Paper text:
Cryo-EM maps of [name], apo RNAP, EC, and type 1 and type 2 complexes are shown. It consists of the N-terminal domain (NTD) and the C-terminal domain (CTD), which have the primary RNA binding site (PBS) and the secondary RNA binding site (SBS), respectively. The [name] hexamer can adopt both open- and closed-ring conformations. When [name] binds RNA and ATP, it assumes the closed-ring conformation to thread the RNA into its central channel composed of the SBS. The purified EC was mixed with [name] in the presence of ADP·[name] and cross-linked with BS3 to stabilize the complex before the preparation of cryo-grids.
Author numbering:
A (entry chain A), B (entry chain B): 60 to 420
The structure:
């Protein structure tokens, strides 16, 4: 028999499991140490095993046996590469980008910031400047382009109506949310839970993509959670308290042996408080691709309102041929003189004629 | 004998009720736990209850019995959905906007800031820039457009003369005020009282609108109440005090099963202290529509002096049909070019000709 959950190991070798609500609910389950030792798995796995109801003198269910682990033979689970020891590479198994629901705006997305397997991406915009629905569109496209990829969406510190909008509009993909109604400890719990789950899932050589609403909101939430860390960075920020979100985003990587972990998250800047500017800068050095969204292009209601000059990716050539290298080099040389708004509208007119590759052809 | 009020449950199951002034008075009455347990009501769910002539040896009145509660059968109260569990949606039961008392400025308001049942709205303006009587006009219009809606007005940290002006000019709708003469404790008491009152009134599937004068003044009141923040935010804010106005404003929501809660509150920016800019940004991400008011437009005495480009709402299409969707799309494409003062003067000249719908026709 297999009850299933996300293992959270307690100090004493036994652990706990949560339910499908992806929040601590009364349906938690307890996990014994002996079986995990028997199969010697790594923390945060999608654990399954046989269990027995709460015994007399026992207030909660307890583990009796295990039959199959992580949907695989437990013996095979005994030997596997460790996630943190996987040889990282640059994204070399690119996800070819072609999505129907909006071929033009999605053309802008593809042509300005490519997305590949294991991309450590980050999108940075001021408040109320085009984030959540953009993430929604990206998720919807991915759920059609690569049905094999396990796509997970995480929402921290956001409005409930957006949560329900996604849950209805995601068409069955794992949508996890934690509205601002919950105390920040709930945010941290859910975030780290999904972090470990994704890590252990990717460790199996799989391709995982996490779309994180409100990452700089999550950073402010850490600051609230941030108990001291010591010295105050400029703007009320903590020095090392960004270490946990730093590792969270740094998980995004390409692995040369198969599988990948790509995180795209929404960051806030120009909020009038140095805290957010410093947070964004601290993340900018850790992500491998950044998407600046210019507040003025949004004020002009040009979507996507991307600050093309400031925006850019790292190692396009590994995702883009020398031919695309040269054509985009020419585009940079030329559009440097074209204004962002006029450039955007010009590109809109041109690409409405043909697909990205058809435009290249 | 029926006493009607808002049960404030104390620690020991016995609670308190207040009087019509919505301020602590000598007329507060005590309540017993047993009947509340019998009818399984929720905090602040409009309580109608019986009692007796208190006995001797009791320093305060004590409750005997209950006859009818929530103006409904108390037994049915035993099983009902809870407010915090209601499935929130975007406002989809729109309140069609047609306001006679001044149809021009209110034309500007309706055509720039849609109002629907459950609108979590926010309006921002520097000091002395057109707030209080604007809220007054909104309240007066609502008291003619939807007589079925229970309209409540809350005034925090404001001048008494405005309080009397409203109480005379509201024509019987619930006007609650707490002048700055009172210490901040009174502000907090009244604010949370109204919070619970509105929440549990909406819990009955009803439509409630709260018009909150002085929301940023209320934020500064919290700052005076800001007990620590731990680390001091830019300007002197609290991390945990802002949680309470955050939840207060986030109460505003649209419910898919009927009823809604709409809060429109007045906010302050450009006050020369980082506190207010930080607070405005903090609320901006929590409200579902924010209305900037430009100080320069007010200096020109343009009412409403709205910074049209900066101002905007979320999910207009959910309130605005495809036809209106495209119409406002064209209007945003065009009016971006018109300068605020001349833009609004032109808008007055044009829309003064016809009603909004007639202008569309
Ligand atoms: N492509 C788009 N076009 C128009 N509006 C958008 C688009 N993408 C997102 N938005 C809007 O931008 C708003 C800001 O996104 P969000 O990340 O929720 O803000 P924050 O996280 O700063 O509170 C969203 O509420 C959404 O309605
Ligand atoms: N449409 C308007 N035209 C002219 N004056 C207005 C208008 N609306 C509000 N006011 C004025 O703006 C003042 C602002 O007071 P208020 O905003 O309540 O103080 P505070 O900002 O301290 O809460 C009011 O006293 C009112 O006289
Ligand atoms: F309103 Be969010 F900060 F984009
Ligand atoms: F009229 Be408000 F105080 F700006
Ligand atoms: Mg949003
Ligand atoms: Mg005013």
């Amino acid at each position: 028999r297999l009850v299933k959950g996300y293992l959270e190991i307690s100090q004493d070798g036994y652990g706990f499991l949560t339910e499908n609500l992806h929040n601590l609910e009364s349906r938690v389950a307890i996990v014994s140490a002996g079986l995990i030792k028997q199969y010697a798995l790594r923390a945060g796995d999608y654990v399954v095993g046989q269990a027995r109801p709460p015994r007399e003198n026992e207030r909660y269910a307890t583990l009796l046996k295990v039959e199959a682990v992580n949907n695989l033979d437990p013996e095979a689970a005994k030997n596997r590469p460790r996630f943190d020891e996987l040889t990282p590479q640059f994204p070399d198994r690119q996800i070819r980008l072609e999505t129907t629901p909006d071929e033009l705006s999605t053309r802008v997305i593809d042509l300005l910031a490519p997305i590949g397997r294991g991309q450590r991406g980050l999108i940075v915009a001021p408040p109320k400047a085009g984030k959540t629905t953009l993430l929604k569109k990206i998720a919807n496209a991915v759920l059609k382009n690569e049905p094999d990829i396990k796509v997970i969406v995480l929402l921290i510190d956001e409005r409930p109506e957006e949560v329900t909008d996604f849950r209805e509009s995601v068409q069955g993909a794992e949508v996890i949310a934690s509205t601002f109604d919950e105390p920040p400890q709930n945010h941290i719990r859910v975030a780290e839970f999904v972090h470990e789950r994704a890590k252990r899932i990717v460790e199996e050589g799989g391709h995982v993509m996490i779309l994180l609403d409100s990452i700089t909101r999550l950073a402010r939430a850490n600051n609230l959670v941030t108990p001291p860390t010591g010295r105050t960075l400029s703007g009320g920020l903590d020095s090392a308290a960004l270490y946990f979100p730093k590792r969270f985003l740094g998980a995004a990587r390409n692995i040369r042996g198969g599988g990948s972990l790509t995180i795209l998250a929404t960051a806030l800047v120009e909020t009038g408080s140095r805290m957010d500017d410093v947070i964004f800068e601290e993340f900018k050095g850790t992500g491998n691709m950044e998407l600046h969204l210019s507040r003025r292009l949004e004020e002009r209601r040009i979507f996507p309102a991307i600050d093309i000059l400031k925006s850019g990716t790292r190692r396009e050539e590994l995702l883009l041929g020398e031919e695309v290298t040269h054509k985009m080099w020419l585009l940079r040389k030329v559009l440097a003189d074209m204004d962002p708004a006029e450039a955007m509208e010009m590109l809109l007119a041109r690409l409405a004629r043909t697909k990205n590759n058809k435009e290249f052809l």
